[PDB]
Amino acid sequence: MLSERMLKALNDQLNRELYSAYLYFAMAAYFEDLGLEGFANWMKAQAEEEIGHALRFYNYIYDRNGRVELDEIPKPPKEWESPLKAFEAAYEHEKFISKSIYELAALAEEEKDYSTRAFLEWFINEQVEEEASVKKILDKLKFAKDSPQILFMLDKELSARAPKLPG
Amino acid sequence: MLSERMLKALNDQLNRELYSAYLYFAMAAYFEDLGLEGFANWMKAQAEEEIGHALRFYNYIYDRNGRVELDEIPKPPKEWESPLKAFEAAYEHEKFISKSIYELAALAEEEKDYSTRAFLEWFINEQVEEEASVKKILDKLKFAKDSPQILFMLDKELSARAPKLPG
Amino acid sequence: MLSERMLKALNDQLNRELYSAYLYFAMAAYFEDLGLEGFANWMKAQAEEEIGHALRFYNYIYDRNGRVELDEIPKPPKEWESPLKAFEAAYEHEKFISKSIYELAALAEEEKDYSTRAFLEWFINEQVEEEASVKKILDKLKFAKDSPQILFMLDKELSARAPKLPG
Amino acid sequence: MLSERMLKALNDQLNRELYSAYLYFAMAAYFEDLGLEGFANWMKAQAEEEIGHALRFYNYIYDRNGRVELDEIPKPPKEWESPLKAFEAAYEHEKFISKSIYELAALAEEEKDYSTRAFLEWFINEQVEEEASVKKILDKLKFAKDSPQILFMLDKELSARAPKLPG
Amino acid sequence: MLSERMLKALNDQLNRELYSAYLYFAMAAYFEDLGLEGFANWMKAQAEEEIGHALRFYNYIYDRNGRVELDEIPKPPKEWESPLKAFEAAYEHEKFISKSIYELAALAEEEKDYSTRAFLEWFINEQVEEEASVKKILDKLKFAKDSPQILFMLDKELSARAPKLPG
Amino acid sequence: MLSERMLKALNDQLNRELYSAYLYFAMAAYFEDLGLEGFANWMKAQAEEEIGHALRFYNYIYDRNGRVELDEIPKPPKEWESPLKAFEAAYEHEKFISKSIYELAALAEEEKDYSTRAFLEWFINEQVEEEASVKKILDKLKFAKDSPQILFMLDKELSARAPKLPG
Ligand SMILES: [Fe+3]
Ligand SMILES: [Fe+3]
Ligand SMILES: [Fe+3]
Ligand SMILES: [Fe+3]
Ligand SMILES: [Fe+3]
Ligand SMILES: [Fe+3]
């Protein structure tokens, strides 16, 4: 009840979600190094959220009597010219993930797989939230052009988002 | 204050820890497919634990004013002849990690890197626990051999261990 | 991320929501004049609800990186021949809001704009409720055709629903 | 508001849901007479859940100002060759309901009936959950091929789920 | 301990109880269509109650080492000329069920099946309550003759009896 | 008890208050668009307050046995050159509402309408507060001429004024 084609498409997205976790982890390491601990914490929390997204794909595949297959996780970029550029890349990256979702939605419509299409509604809606969140910080970073004072401040605000795992 | 060898070595250990997260996750998918939800949830818990280990290097590295670098994470194996064989691989894998910790310890001693070597004590003691914990289960499995009545009971026990994240 | 056709239909639907708030406020004022303070309040509660619906569009717009534009709000009718008529009016108004939404859904599908299509599901569902709830009363006012005892009773019932804001 | 074609199809699904409740009540009796009280209670609770499904249809039909009409409920099977063959029937049956739902979804789309499509969305996700929960147990019964020992411990696990009407 | 006859007769009453539930559900749909929400809830509560009655039979039957057989449940009337006539139809059905209980009892006494006769004692008493319950309402609907304003208040009186399952 | 002219002057001021809600809501969209979420929330709260002022007239008109008549709320401006400019436009708006209220006091005095003139005392005081409330913010904006860091902190302060409706 999953087509061989759809399974590959779902396992592929599961892999994109994990890569997406890892990129944020890479971004955390990058903010860490800049000393911006709040930014860094936000990125870890984001990383954890992406692992969550991956598990959602994992559970759906099992629910549909499929079989998860795990693929290499590409090595993410090490750095970025500035916090603003990191967020630009996060944004571009969320835009990339959405497109993959639409493509998945399209394939599910074409196959007449209502289950998978329904399962994806959740990601269509979550991605709206995901892009808006990244956009909102990206713009504050624009508005903070030649001003470390504001960078410092945003850093403190973002630190309110703590990754749920360590403790 | 970390020599470039040390930094490279901690980073490789960080990546080894992530690979284990992933190998264990790969094991969770293998059990899930067999419909052994107890084992499946044990592997996901084990997988989070490994991410934890990963962050300890992360944390240590930054404390010594290093820079983390994330590397690609290899495709894990997909399948195993049997639950026993997967636990065997897990056991063999932990033995692999323990040897790595020793190689790192020896590295830290030769360089007279007291800080790093202190940092590794935690890993020497944890790896004793890790090895013993997988062996216990692996032995319970040799004991079941040709008894699904026991795999059933083993599954159920193991379901006691659950991953934090989903919640 | 929002096409120009979408942006327009969304602001339009936002202004359509604001005008319902005003229409219902108009009916509140009609009911008040008939001394029917129960109906008048329920209408004021419905206005507040419509403003809520307008804020839902306002938010989705900004989330999709859009720009809200506020247009003029037409003067609503002043009078109706009877309580039954004003509810008939309000039912037809809801059936009209509904079709404005179906129209938005249709546009979204033509443009292959999954996020917007997905965001409207909520409105499709709320409208089912909106229509059913206006209808339940409408029905109770046909039963109460020529008999002010029941009209007087409905009034007390509907005063249960109060507007939250004057608090 | 509801096309004749649509309303008759919804009434037909309502009847389908009731025959489901009846089918599982039939499985409940089949299991009691085997002295599998756990199995029997599971099936009872399932029956109740199906009545709930029938009520969602009833509610939706009335919310669209339609009219429910009840058709006769056919006599269900009395017996199955074994607990496994019984769960095979249930699984084959949940698939049949899924198809009925997909067919309905296709009909709503074809007639541009957005409201009914949105309503059916809950059944597309619920059926995913339905088929999975029957498959987990179906597979457990395969894994207990010739083994009353496991059958007995399944019966005891299933007894956790219990019908609410005795209360 | 149950003769072929008693088993047959009992499995038959079980079915009538089920049909009874179905019939009340049918009147629930009828009252709901008229916009009589109170009356409609009352009838759904009565339907569950009848399912409860079926369960007592089901439980007695397995108590005596019998086997429950389920039979098809016939189409009930869609429609009544008025609320009063539904209630007349209701009452007549309750007397019909009572008569079938008495025959059951009488067959018990004849075969000298003390256990079965004793089981029915519950139903003998419950039926007294059932008929009285229906008659009170029946009679109040007569008292309401040409008074929508009374029917309104009766509906509101009845909304206090609510079905339990939806929760 | 209300002169034909008074009612008209009261209904106009009612409408003026609604237009105020709209104006402030426009300025909300404006600030939202700049990503100044705190100004945006302030403005949404003030929008609500304005709706409150309208209801005050609405209540008075019905107390004195008048009828409320609602008029078209015109299109407010979409844009302003800067946040400071918006607050200048709002001060100017409030000053005009004030003038509007004096004209109403003068009228009621001149018509020797004592009820109406006393009703307005509330507004004469409220406008003092309104004007000053805007002036304080407007002046802080002058104070923060070419300093985005002060714009930022002022945004965080105003964020404390939350509208009361999203809940
Ligand atoms: Fe994601
Ligand atoms: Fe994401
Ligand atoms: Fe998110
Ligand atoms: Fe480890
Ligand atoms: Fe380990
Ligand atoms: Fe451990």
Ligand SMILES: [Fe+3]
């Ligand atoms: Fe609305």
Ligand SMILES: [Fe+3]
């Ligand atoms: Fe509405």
Ligand SMILES: [Fe+3]
């Ligand atoms: Fe509503």
Ligand SMILES: [Fe+3]
């Ligand atoms: Fe169902």
Ligand SMILES: [Fe+3]
């Ligand atoms: Fe089902």
Ligand SMILES: [Fe+3]
């Ligand atoms: Fe279910």
Ligand SMILES: [Fe+3]
């Ligand atoms: Fe009964």
Ligand SMILES: [Fe+3]
């Ligand atoms: Fe009865």
Ligand SMILES: [Fe+3]
């Ligand atoms: Fe009773």
Ligand SMILES: [Fe+3]
């Ligand atoms: Fe005002």
Ligand SMILES: [Fe+3]
């Ligand atoms: Fe004001």
Ligand SMILES: [Fe+3]
């Ligand atoms: Fe004020």
